[PDB]
């Protein structure tokens with residue numbers, strides 16, 4: 001018997017699933033608590049949906065619990081059994097009262113009704129509501145593909161909500177989509193249709209977050225980020241939440257403590273607003289998976305606003321602060337999951353007692369090519385395509401990971417002819433944002449759109465070129481898609497691309513284990529998805 005079963009991220013054991021201990025570090029019991037949190041949440045999804053159907057209101061506070069639950073179960077997000085158990089209790093209470101409000105409490109699934117307050121009971125319930133619970137291969141593949149897509153969506157929705165932006169149609173769809181993954185009467189065609197609709201709402205979440213980020217901190221602009229370090233003690237902030245960064249910087253003003261970014265917080269450097277704080281140093285390190293090394297050589301406090309957090313080493317566990325839905329037993333947690341005021345004076349005091357950062361690289365990188373910035377260079381990018389200056393755009397956005405086969409992406413980018421342009425977003429950029437690919441007619445051969453949620457800009461840019469060149473099919477543009485994925489956020493980006501009609505997508509370093517043969521077949525026949533081989537072989541085939 002398996003102590004657990006999880007295959008939501010690309011590093012899943014044998015690309016089949018984790019049964020004893022997650023490669024990520026997630027323990028059997030933590031994964032069980034996560035399986036219960038999802039079940040009762042979907043259960044809460046059905047209740048909130050029935051209420052809206054009866055014409056009744058559902059306070060937004062409910063939409064926040066749902067998103068918080070989902071996000072907390074994303075890879076490298078929360079490993080704290082105490083916070084998961086309590087969130088399971090919170091969800092049981094919440095759904096128990098919303099359901100009291102219904103008029104016709106009929107047909108409510110088990111997930112909607114079941115409840116427990118004792119951790120031991122939650123672990124038993126989990127043992128029968130996890131993945132395996134769905135027998136039929138094709139319907140399981142689709143139910144979990146949507147659920148993961150819904151995890152990524154929720155995360156983007158929460159960051160938009162943290163900035164005060166939220167749409168009722170988004171929260172309503174999410175909650176209804178979750179309720180449908182428990183419906184035994186949905187055909188496979190229904191689930192395929194729901195997979196595409198999810199992708200659609202995927203585009204909405206990213207568009208909602210794009211607006212929230214840009215509206216509060218300005219449109220990203222061409223920026224030069226220093227990757228070297230200073231001499232003052234500092235705090236390294238990681239993740240994707242920009243709100244926490246505004247508070248951290250306002251509060252670190254005048255204390256002598258500098259602020260650095262890590263992994264997916266690099267893009268914050270691209271915003272005009274944050275450029276007004278003198279103590280906002282550079283971006284330290286690379287993708288998340290090198291944090292055991294980089295968090296250590298940074299010497300100062302490390303703030304994790306979201307995933308990806310790798311189980312800490314004792315050498316720096318004491319200076320690791322989590323916040324929002326992030327969590328690790330033994331690591332100090334700063335309360336706040338809705339952009340409310342956060343008190344970072346403890347982490348700022350802690351930094352004054354730490355050695356300044358130990359430099360590991362010097363120089364700088366260019367970035368800030370989001371939709372608003374590239375559209376302003378449109379005519380210039382278009383004259384380059386027309387003249388043959390830029391023979392091909394290569395989208396390599398996505399998420400990075402530990403797999404050493406990912407050296408592929410570094411060789412791919414390194415081997416591309418010098419008349420091509422790489423478009424990136426997401427921490428997958430680290431595999432090649434530190435090389436020297438030069439430029440084409442003054443346009444960098446690596447255009448960083450931003451975070452993974454900024455794949456949205458790459459999408460906008462493409463639709464724009466299709467309009468300009470008056471093409472009927474977006475796929476007729478000189479764009480090759482060589483995307484890398486890791487967790488559920490990369491999975492909602494993919495479904496967004498599929499809903500937008502983008503085809504010929506190459507996914508790697510491997511294809512999701514939760515994609516069953518027949519389901520994988522449809523992706524191949526309808527959107528022509530493919531995997532990768534050698535960088536030299538694909539540099540020939542892909543073109």
Ligand code: SF4
Pocket residue numbers: 006007008009010011012013017018021022023024025026075076
């Ligand atoms: S999140 Fe990935 S590594 Fe961790 S248990 Fe899941 S599938 Fe395995």
